[PDB]
Paper text:
[name] receptors are chloride permeable, γ-amino butyric acid ([name])-gated ion channels that are responsible for the majority of fast inhibitory neurotransmission in the mammalian nervous system. [name] receptors belong to the pentameric ligand-gated ion channel (pLGIC) superfamily. The large number of subunits gives rise to many possible pentameric assemblies; nevertheless, the most prevalent subunit combination in the vertebrate brain is the tri-heteromeric receptor composed of two α, two β and one γ subunit, with the arrangement of subunits being β-α-β-γ-α, in a clockwise order when viewed from the extracellular space. Here we present methods for the expression and isolation of tri-heteromeric [name] receptors and the cryo-EM structure of the rat α1β1γ2SEM [name] receptor in the presence of [name].
Three dimensional reconstruction, combined with judicious masking of either the Fab constant domains or, alternatively, the receptor transmembrane domain (TMD), allowed for reconstructions at ~3.8 and ~3.1 Å resolution, respectively, based on Fourier shell correlation (FSC) analysis. While the M1, M2 and M3 helices of all subunits show strong density, with density for some residues with large side chains, the M4 helices of the two α1 subunits and the γ2S subunit have weak density and thus we have not attempted to include them in the structure. Nevertheless, the density of the M1, M2 and M3 helices is well defined, allowing us to reliably position the helices.
Author numbering:
A (entry chain B), B (entry chain E): 10 to 302, 320 to 345
C (entry chain A), D (entry chain C): 12 to 307
E (entry chain D): 25 to 323
Amino acid sequence: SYVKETVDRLLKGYDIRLRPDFGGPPVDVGMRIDVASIDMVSEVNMDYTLTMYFQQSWKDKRLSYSGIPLNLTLDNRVADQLWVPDTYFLNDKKSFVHGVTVKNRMIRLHPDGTVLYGLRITTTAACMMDLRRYPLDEQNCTLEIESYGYTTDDIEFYWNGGEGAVTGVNKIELPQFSIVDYKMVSKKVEFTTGAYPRLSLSFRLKRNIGYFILQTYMPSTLITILSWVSFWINYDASAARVALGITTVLTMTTISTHLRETLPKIPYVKAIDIYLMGCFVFVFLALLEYAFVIDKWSRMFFPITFSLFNVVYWLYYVH
Amino acid sequence: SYVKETVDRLLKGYDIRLRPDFGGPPVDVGMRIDVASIDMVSEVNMDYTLTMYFQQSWKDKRLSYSGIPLNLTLDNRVADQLWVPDTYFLNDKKSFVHGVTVKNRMIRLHPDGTVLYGLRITTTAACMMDLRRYPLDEQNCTLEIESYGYTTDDIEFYWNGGEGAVTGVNKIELPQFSIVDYKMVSKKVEFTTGAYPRLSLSFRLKRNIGYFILQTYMPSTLITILSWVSFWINYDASAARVALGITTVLTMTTISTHLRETLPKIPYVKAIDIYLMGCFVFVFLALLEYAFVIDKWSRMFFPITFSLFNVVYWLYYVH
Amino acid sequence: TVFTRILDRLLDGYDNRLRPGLGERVTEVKTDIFVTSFGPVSDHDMEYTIDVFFRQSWKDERLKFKGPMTVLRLNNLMASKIWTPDTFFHNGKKSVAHNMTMPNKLLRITEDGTLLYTMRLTVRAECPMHLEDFPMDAHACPLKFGSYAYTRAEVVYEWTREPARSVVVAEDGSRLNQYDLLGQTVDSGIVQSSTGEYVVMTTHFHLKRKIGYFVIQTYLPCIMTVILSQVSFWLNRESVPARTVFGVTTVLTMTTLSISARNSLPKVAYATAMDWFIAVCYAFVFSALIEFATVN
Amino acid sequence: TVFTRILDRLLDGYDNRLRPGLGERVTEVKTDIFVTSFGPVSDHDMEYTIDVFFRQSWKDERLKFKGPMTVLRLNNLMASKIWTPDTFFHNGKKSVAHNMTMPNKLLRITEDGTLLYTMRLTVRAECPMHLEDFPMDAHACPLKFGSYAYTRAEVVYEWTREPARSVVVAEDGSRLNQYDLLGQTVDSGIVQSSTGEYVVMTTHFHLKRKIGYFVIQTYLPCIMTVILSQVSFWLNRESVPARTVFGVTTVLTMTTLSISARNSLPKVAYATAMDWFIAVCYAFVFSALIEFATVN
Amino acid sequence: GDVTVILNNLLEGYDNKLRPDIGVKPTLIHTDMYVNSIGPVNAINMEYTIDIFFAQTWYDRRLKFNSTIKVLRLNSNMVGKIWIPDTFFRNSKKADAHWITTPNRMLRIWNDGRVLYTLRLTIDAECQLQLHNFPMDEHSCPLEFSSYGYPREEIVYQWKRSSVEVGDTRSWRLYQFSFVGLRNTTEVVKTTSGDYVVMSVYFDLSRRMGYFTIQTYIPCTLIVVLSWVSFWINKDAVPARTSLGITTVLTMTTLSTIARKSLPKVSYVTAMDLFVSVCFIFVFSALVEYGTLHYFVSN
Ligand SMILES: *[C@@H]1O[C@H](CO)[C@@H](O[C@@H]2O[C@H](CO)[C@@H](O[C@@H]3O[C@H](CO[C@H]4O[C@H](CO)[C@@H](O)[C@H](O[C@H]5O[C@H](CO)[C@@H](O)[C@H](O)[C@@H]5O)[C@@H]4O)[C@@H](O)[C@H](O[C@H]4O[C@H](CO)[C@@H](O)[C@H](O)[C@@H]4O[C@H]4O[C@H](CO)[C@@H](O)[C@H](O)[C@@H]4O)[C@@H]3O)[C@H](O)[C@H]2NC(C)=O)[C@H](O)[C@H]1NC(C)=O
Ligand SMILES: *[C@@H]1O[C@H](CO)[C@@H](O[C@@H]2O[C@H](CO)[C@@H](O[C@@H]3O[C@H](CO)[C@@H](O)[C@H](O[C@H]4O[C@H](CO)[C@@H](O)[C@H](O)[C@@H]4O)[C@@H]3O)[C@H](O)[C@H]2NC(C)=O)[C@H](O)[C@H]1NC(C)=O
Ligand SMILES: *[C@@H]1O[C@H](CO)[C@@H](O[C@@H]2O[C@H](CO)[C@@H](O[C@@H]3O[C@H](CO)[C@@H](O)[C@H](O)[C@@H]3O)[C@H](O)[C@H]2NC(C)=O)[C@H](O)[C@H]1NC(C)=O
Ligand SMILES: *[C@@H]1O[C@H](CO)[C@@H](O[C@@H]2O[C@H](CO)[C@@H](O[C@@H]3O[C@H](CO)[C@@H](O)[C@H](O)[C@@H]3O)[C@H](O)[C@H]2NC(C)=O)[C@H](O)[C@H]1NC(C)=O
Ligand SMILES: *[C@@H]1O[C@H](CO)[C@@H](O[C@@H]2O[C@H](CO)[C@@H](O)[C@H](O)[C@H]2NC(C)=O)[C@H](O)[C@H]1NC(C)=O
Ligand SMILES: *[C@@H]1O[C@H](CO)[C@@H](O[C@@H]2O[C@H](CO)[C@@H](O)[C@H](O)[C@H]2NC(C)=O)[C@H](O)[C@H]1NC(C)=O
């Protein structure tokens, strides 16, 4: 029953509306990020969804004790009665604290004065994805830790562990992308109001090529089969020849309307559309040689044009 | 004036967390539901949205008063200072109280002590959807009213008014389904913890056949044409007759895409898909055996078996 | 009348922010669940749904009393004052604590010092499904939960009844439409964290895909197409344009059905078994067009 | 230690129901908007999305002091107990106030008595456009804001810096896909209502479409059709019914261009520019096809 | 600091959980609204969204104060410490008030005891199921409210002006249809808990035919002319006329689905599927005549 009087001594006389070590030096805040999972990437809304432990720690004079030897894990509702930093995320769109039983707020106190505050939060952060080249992607999806109402002479940030402040990157299993590297960058960013610390957790996303590369082969094999249908046959039964070239536009249409819901209406550069242009202009070239009718010469010229086409595609892929 | 000090003594000395007759007889609770609308019966998510005027009434000797022969409707800021029963719904997913101007929370008091409580609740309740027979299927989706933390020795539920406790059901209109009957069930459920009362309000939903007969009759003309053109064209250019029946296969594929966008994957097979795929296999095999070998036999075989398939389909449909 | 006078004696001196212990015995909480239902799996974004009752029980020596009756039932209002543990799910990405006229939380204080505290929940947890065999899926969906701030030296979770047998209860109501509940398997573990060491209660749900949902939906059209692939071999040697035009008319539907089968299928870099089934169909197509061009 | 007594001195009888200067001059509100990223523009819902740092400031004579420091960067819990203006957006549809570890509100008192109060908001608003230049139109999305319960004789808005230099795109705050942000234009304005006359700060964002694939993916399948129309009327040395079925594809391409356009714009009553732009391309087809069907 | 004294004198002895006129007065309340926008009628949920400025006015014998202040303006912070009458919308699916940036709650108190109050509300209300004539649309779209707790003997709603008290001044406000007029309606509905007055507000609309003009023209200017050139072509060649006719009905099928794709299915006919089915069965009869002519030319 000794601990209750000490906690009441710590609370009676405390002001939540002041930062610790007030009127003096800036206080440091150490962060730690435990990425649970990249929850949901969305190429429609130019964004992704992340679930992580955001842990942070600092030091104060207002909370110190000497009687209790061990550390003091305390209830989460004392966070409404203790000072915390106003750390936010810049590129977010919709975020929340998980409240499945309570607010997941880890409050741990030390006899020194080291105060620990932990959250399990899910953030839907935007990522400026450049969709110019589709097979290779190499994104840079940032995650901008930044204070809100404290200037750089009032606060400073640091990674608690350097590279060791970020834990759990290798345990991420994404069905659509793959991590190749992650980077933690500190940066001082000024505004009209003032200067602010800004940590950045960035990482690249190499797309898992197998799913879309098995979706890519089907129009190519389809149009090679269509070329071999329209090429080898004699044209006395010309209705057998022309009905092959009739139904090519619906085959192009199915793949185009399937991809049009996946990728948005970005006008700039679409590499899938460049590939489908190399396909459908080749469809028009096959029909052009048909209306020009040399059939065996066009049949031999079709595979070497397909080979130079997907060689151009492969060198566009490997850059 | 005089009424304010009578309300004040009802608020003074009251304990919220203690039920009436705590340690005595079980309290008696009368409930009432007023269905406003059946909003959307989502077959894919297997749920329905219900707007309801939920209403409770009970007895409390602590909340009576001598004079003022009239009823005292109060603000909604007394329900947080009074006891309410913890009545939840079992199979809900998204449910809330509407907060249009305030929280729609009616407290009506009485000089003997009969307390009336009222809420306007929208509930997205899930129900079992057996989709074996698709037309005229009584889905029998229910709403399960149940208390949470009071054993049957502490509470008593009943329908306030008998069978007339559920109103406004005849005033509901749906574009897809139709009310055929509603029923009230008052049972007891034993858990590991204890015994709890349960009210259950059922809804058997006769689906209106007009949208169903439109989305049935629109593809039936296609297989009718598939029979008629196969019976009607001479077999010199036999590929010109067979290729139309193979385009009916992709017509079936478009119908199957509409089906997959309209229905999920279910192990118990439906009643709509089976006759269309059965007549599909028959109209394909008729074209196959017609191209296998003839003009009179095509006129004789296909309409008779077609009408036979029609009448056996109707005889399965009437059940 | 009387019980208000004793609840104030219970609240007198009981700090709402401290667990019993702290230079004393390790706090033990007794954990029980009750699966109300098991919601549908969402294979596109690779998750599932569950809604359960979640029970907890522990002893607080600062809550004993001497009353007329044995146990004492309360509302969620008093339940916000007694210290409860921070039980969170490791796999839940979006969860709701349901409330309707009250928070769905009861508090049953025993005279012995123990208490019961349960809540009705709903968890949208996910499973890392491997997709090497989509009709032959067999998955063990985890439902890990532990403490959030209290160390193994602070609290330890323990199942109430028989763990491997009767600590988890399926209540025979399942709204599933693609899978079926084979069984369940609880587990206990310790996860070494960057903060400290924490107990972990694991529960796996063994699931296999039903056979009449999509398996027949793929099995009927592929058999239809391999039947349509035979008629070109049935064709005459003096009927050479028909054997040519049959193949393109066959593949027009084969492509659309492959698109439809890959439509509801989520994205995976690993190859699926139905991707080899449509490959067998395309190989029959390739053999048919080889036998066509042999005549040509 | 001393600052606790200071802040307790500034609340001895302080009120929040009264603006500074009742029975005195009106209040002066400096206002600044620092946008972060101009988000997506839902043309199907004619609304855009934008992330702002909404700064605003006003002098309050009731809070002067002679303390050791001049400006104290206080917490927003203090700002909840201080008077604030009732600013709101006149055309906002679904605006969110971002909440985190603390709410994204700032407060900086000054020994002069001047304040500073920014809110990191995300506001969406309807941008009512017209489709008279539906391929390559350009619009000015508005953003109107002002007081709700305070008339022009109560509060007065004014931009903080010069109005040319008071709405700032950061460096590259462009979540834009279809459009190109180029400029902006603010102004004041007094709107008479049924209650009174409220001052309104109005801001227009000028934006114009990228030409791009919105022209390419619509004109190149039309380019193939108009090339096939020239190829059909080239010569007649070969068979004539080889040309007629060439019309049939140009039928179904008219299908594919019809579905491809309607999924972006709302169902408007008036015809647009791109609709006639494809209608003339449709009219180029069937006239020549009826002509060839009559003569051949 | 005079108003600080006056308003704090208006706090003690005033319960914020009681209506003022518990006695013989039935507490009549005037009301009005200013329609800011009427959003899209999506018709899939058969609902429409609408933004209004909704305002209420009542009296009190417990808030009369002294002179030298005609009316005092209040922020959104005295609404919780003053009794506010209830108002709830009947057909509201999700009527969420706006809470952004110190929420929109304007309050005024005169010396007489008159209290003005207002809000800023968006509604997604049900309108009707009017699918008799699909081009000839005429929806009324009622909007109605009551007190959820207080009956007609304890609360009375009243307008400010007979049927034209609702201000509405806009031209482009997400209306894909044509708004033609509005009116009010005051009724009393017998409920179970009591009798409550209902203040119905309609919004007369009519669908502009220019939206369905593109949906009607381009199938009509394709299918009918394809059926015409099926007969106008030389019928000596069997793969010309029958092939054109059989691909025309292949094209004509999907446009009926896409024309009914954005809007849900109904039970009764809407005289639009009947409007396209006549031409559909006409091209089908052209197919029947073409198949009849084949039976007597290949002899
Ligand atoms: C099941 O559990 C959930 C989770 O707790 C409950 O949801 C919460 O319910 C409470 C109680 O109704 C809400 O608290 C109240 O919130 C008022 C405004 O808060 C707004 O917060 C943010 C913006 O800051 C919005 O996003 C919110 O909107 C959400 O909720 C609405 C509700 O319908 C939804 O429709 C939306 O879609 C959002 O989801 C909220 O609008 C707040 O003003 C109020 O506080 C006043 O009153 C209390 C008690 O008197 C005191 O704290 C205090 O007096 C406050 O009064 C001050 O301010 C007023 C302003 O007018 C002044 O007049 C006063 O003088 C004084 O200065 C209260 O805190 C909470 O917002 C809500 N949370 C969410 C996420 O929904 C469910 O209700 C619950 N279900 C049950 C019980 O059935
Ligand atoms: C944005 O995030 C902040 C994070 O701090 C959050 O502020 C917190 O809000 C909660 C309520 O939502 C506050 O909790 C209250 O604290 C007071 C203090 O005395 C209590 O009296 C209140 O008790 C009420 O609710 C209890 C719930 O069990 C019941 O006992 C009872 O019904 C009481 O009426 C209540 O617990 C908390 O203090 C703040 N923290 C601050 C301001 O630092 C804010 O709500 C978030 N805004 C959103 C989500 O819009
Ligand atoms: C995503 O893009 C950002 C910027 O476009 C990249 O940030 C940049 O990272 C490099 C490597 O750390 C920084 O270079 C060096 O930074 C240190 C620390 O500040 C500095 O001392 C050196 O002089 C040098 O500049 C660079 O400054 C930084 N730029 C910015 C604007 O922050 C980031 O690395 C990218 N992430 C991925 C995964 O590609
Ligand atoms: C289909 O709907 C019916 C009602 O529309 C429901 O079945 C009801 O189920 C309850 C309990 O599950 C039973 O009611 C019993 O009634 C008897 C006689 O009154 C009573 O003595 C029992 O104590 C019990 O209350 C009964 O099976 C049935 N009741 C009725 C009136 O049909 C349920 O919603 C659905 N049932 C099925 C089988 O799908
Ligand atoms: C209280 O918490 C502190 C902070 O982590 C602990 O101090 C560290 O404990 C780890 C344990 O592996 C050691 O490796 C570090 O060397 C310690 N650092 C310092 C500066 O002491 C401390 O041990 C905890 N105490 C208790 C009783 O749990
Ligand atoms: C207050 O409410 C009670 C509860 O309904 C009313 O008592 C009943 O009123 C109805 C109709 O007014 C009639 O059945 C009887 O007058 C009452 N029946 C019983 C069993 O009490 C009461 O009338 C209401 N008070 C007033 C003034 O109307």
